[PDB]
Amino acid sequence: GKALVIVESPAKAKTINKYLGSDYVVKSSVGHIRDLPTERGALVNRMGVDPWHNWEAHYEVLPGKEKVVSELKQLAEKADHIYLATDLDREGEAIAWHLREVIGGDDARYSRVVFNEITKNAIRQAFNKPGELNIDRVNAQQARRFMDRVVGYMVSPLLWKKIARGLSAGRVQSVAVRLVVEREREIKAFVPEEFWEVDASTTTPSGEALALQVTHQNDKPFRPVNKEQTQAAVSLLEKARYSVLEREDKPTTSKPGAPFITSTLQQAASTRLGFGVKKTMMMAQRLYEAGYITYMRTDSTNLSQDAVNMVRGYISDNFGKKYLPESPNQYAREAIRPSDVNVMAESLKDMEADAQKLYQLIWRQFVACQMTPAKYDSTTLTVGAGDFRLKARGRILRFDGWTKVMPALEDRILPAVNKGDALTLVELTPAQHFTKPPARFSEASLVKELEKRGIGRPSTYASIISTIQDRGYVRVENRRFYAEKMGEIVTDRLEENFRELMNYDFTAQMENNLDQVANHEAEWKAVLDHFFSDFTQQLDKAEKDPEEGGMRPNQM
């Protein structure tokens, strides 16, 4: 009469089993057990969803899983209660729902447990206060699944006819491609402009070197556009008398960043470790299922009281009181953090070197976010030379604070000077510059852009960036995105005939609509109806000849 606990993977099963007694029987479902299949009637059969019959679905047990279903059913017959312990996101809720639907029995037989990490305490708490399956969240997940299916299965065939066979369309994927295509065109159309900078090397009364940058001339910003103007300025600067107009000394500080969320982990791992978003998320999942970090799909910077107490104790013992803020730093269901601050990257079991590196990144970010700010003594010198104004900036680290937990180190240290001091000109160095086009997207900046526009979600950031590449619309080279010709071809056609679908605001709004379903503020089938109404309006027109406003063929 034990209890049956179901999780999605053998890795999760092994970890969670360490924290569940003999009264519990833990079993993996070996992944998703049931899902959508992988003229109009044939279309509906392929999609597994019927937009014309109120979204009736035809789910099918995944290949090779009938055996898993049988195994779970037999285990269920011997259990007094069943605990669905899938991951906490909407996808996890839907997996739990599918499990309940295939196993059967009364709903009172099931409970849905939620935890942000697999630890003795988190599991104990999750099973002490078990919840119920949330159908609104399930409906939100399926609405997303159905919209995505409709776009992929109904737009793609149009692309095969009009542009080229094999092309794949995606609801959000196409919008992400649009971002890259626009950037490509901005760069192609950019016309650089020439401008010069002039630096002066001087010496203080004590003879110390002081480098200055010319900032103004006649009280206006200094920015010569050619050699002639630069040389004329250099001529005046060579003859000028230099003196310190003002010396400003003020204490400044640098605060540590918030603990990671999915988006920021992807950005940091890419920029700091050179890890692609796919690699980062795969390793993060392994760390999470092994019980080393909190759940890797989150947009919350919240930290539990226990987690904060844990890390503050670590800081106090290992760095000292000067590194401990009076009260915890609050940044805000939880950020991505170590499950146990006392577990070092070097101690991780069955984790590859790069996975240890990711853990270390997460660990240092978490520890640093609860440490005190770094303190600097900043100095800005303003120098006058005839009608010119020059500046020099520097700073001295006074207290490392949170930077102590980061790798050992560079900031400029200006010499001691007093307002009114004369400076001796040693050298002048003009430098030609050119304005630059918008920077290309990097994996880090693309994720950031998706987040900024409200198009990406923790569960989709990685998938979006990966798909747009495999589908041949964009490519990454030298760590930067480049739009492919086909990317531009498809994007133009989609913008022309599927304006609403391609619109950034509408796409962000759809994410909001799904959240509304999840929070019982909207009904899933009605949301799908509205989506489909607007969609079919775009599709019907697009299928027509170009002369009638239909999609332009890929020719000439």
Curated annotation (Swiss-Prot):
The chain holds residues 2 to 592 of 865 of the full protein. Releases the supercoiling and torsional tension of DNA, which is introduced during the DNA replication and transcription, by transiently cleaving and rejoining one strand of the DNA duplex. Introduces a single-strand break via transesterification at a target site in duplex DNA. The scissile phosphodiester is attacked by the catalytic tyrosine of the enzyme, resulting in the formation of a DNA-(5'-phosphotyrosyl)-enzyme intermediate and the expulsion of a 3'-OH DNA strand. The free DNA strand then undergoes passage around the unbroken strand, thus removing DNA supercoils. Mg(2+) binds at residues 8, 87. GO terms for molecular function: DNA binding; DNA topoisomerase activity; DNA topoisomerase type I (single strand cut, ATP-independent) activity; RNA topoisomerase activity; zinc ion binding. Its cofactor is Mn(2+); Ca(2+). Has been used to construct a 2,4,6-trinitrotoluene (TNT) biosensor strain. It comes from Escherichia coli (strain K12). Residues 2-118 form the Toprim domain. Induction: Transcription is increased specifically in response to 2,4,6-trinitrotoluene (TNT) and its indicator compounds 1,3-DNB, 2,4-DNT, and 2,6-DNT. One of its GO terms (biological process) is DNA topological change. Keywords: DNA-binding, Isomerase, Magnesium, Metal-binding, Repeat, Topoisomerase, Zinc, Zinc-finger. The keyword Acetylation does not apply. Changing residue 87 to A: Abolishes both magnesium binding and enzyme activity. Binds two Mg(2+) ions per subunit. The magnesium ions form salt bridges with both the protein and the DNA. Can also accept other divalent metal cations, such as Mn(2+) or Ca(2+). Residues 134-539 form the Topo IA-type catalytic domain. Belongs to the type IA topoisomerase family. This is DNA topoisomerase 1. Residues 168-173 are annotated as: Interaction with DNA.
